[PDB]
């Protein structure tokens, strides 16, 4: 089959004063740039312990960390 | 005693601390007269002469 991949994805920011930015269409002259880390799953720390002098390790706990999100905006 | 410790990096463990059986001799007192009431202790010192082991 033949197909253009043009996703429906809309990205908007609402600021601390209630002003808005469309980062997809750029009607405020601002666009999200080609580098994003920290969308999708948040970071997790998983903790394990040694079972004494025996094979492997045992699961203790896991914790979701803060989401550190790194991106750029292109400003015309 | 025993400690249950949770560290800031997430390790949880138990530590148990023991004293050797020698510690009994620190919780035993040599009475001036073992055979009498503590209300009446004569002679005033326990004193014994002999070979050190005995």
């Amino acid at each position: 089959a033949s197909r253009l991949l043009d996703p429906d994805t809309l990205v908007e920011l609402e600021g601390v004063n209630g002003e808005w930015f469309d980062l997809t269409n750029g009607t405020e002259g601002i666009y999200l740039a080609t580098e994003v880390t920290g969308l999708l799953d948040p970071p997790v720390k998983a903790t394990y312990e040694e079972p004494g002098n025996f094979p492997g390790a045992r699961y203790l706990n896991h914790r979701v960390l803060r989401r550190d999100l790194v991106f750029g905006v292109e400003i015309l | 005693h025993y400690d249950i410790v949770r560290t800031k990096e997430g390790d949880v463990y138990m530590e148990v601390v023991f004293k050797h059986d020698y510690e009994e001799l620190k919780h035993i007192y040599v009475w001036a007269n073992p055979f009498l009431r503590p209300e009446f202790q004569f002679p005033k010192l326990w004193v014994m002469f002999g070979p050190a082991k005995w």
Side-chain angles (χ1 to χ4, degrees), chain B residues 38-53:
Chain B
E39 321 305 325
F40 191 90
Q41 285 291 294
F42 192 87
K44 281 169 59 169
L45 279 75
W46 176 260
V47 193
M48 176 162 279
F49 184 91
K53 165 167 180 153

Side-chain angles (χ1 to χ4, degrees), chain A residues 45 47-49 60-61, chain B residues 6 9-13:
Chain A
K45 187 179 196 290
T47 306
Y48 281 72
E49 67 158 1
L60 290 186
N61 280 300
Chain B
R6 212 197 87 237
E9 77 287 348
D11 190 11
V12 79
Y13 61 88

Side-chain angles (χ1 to χ4, degrees), chain B residues 7-53:
Chain B
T7 67
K8 65 186 289 152
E9 77 287 348
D11 190 11
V12 79
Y13 61 88
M14 170 175 281
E15 243 276 315
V16 193
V17 178
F18 311 85
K19 284 171 175 156
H20 184 266
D21 280 326
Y22 185 88
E23 183 65 8
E24 298 286 4
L25 305 178
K26 302 195 184 186
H27 301 269
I28 292 163
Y29 291 83
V30 179
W31 286 24
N33 194 344
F35 304 105
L36 291 180
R37 295 168 284 139
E39 321 305 325
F40 191 90
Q41 285 291 294
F42 192 87
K44 281 169 59 169
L45 279 75
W46 176 260
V47 193
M48 176 162 279
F49 184 91
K53 165 167 180 153

Side-chain angles (χ1 to χ4, degrees), chain A residues 48-67:
Chain A
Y48 281 72
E49 67 158 1
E50 298 80 6
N53 193 233
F54 285 92
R58 186 187 290 108
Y59 168 87
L60 290 186
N61 280 300
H62 76 288
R63 182 196 199 298
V64 180
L65 303 179
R66 79 192 196 226
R67 184 187 294 267

Side-chain angles (χ1 to χ4, degrees), chain A residues 18-41:
Chain A
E19 297 184 25
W20 280 81
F21 299 80
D22 182 338
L23 313 184
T24 294
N25 302 293
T27 50
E28 300 68 53
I30 269 150
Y31 294 85
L32 187 67
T34 63
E35 175 179 45
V36 180
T37 292
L39 296 182
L40 310 178
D41 288 330

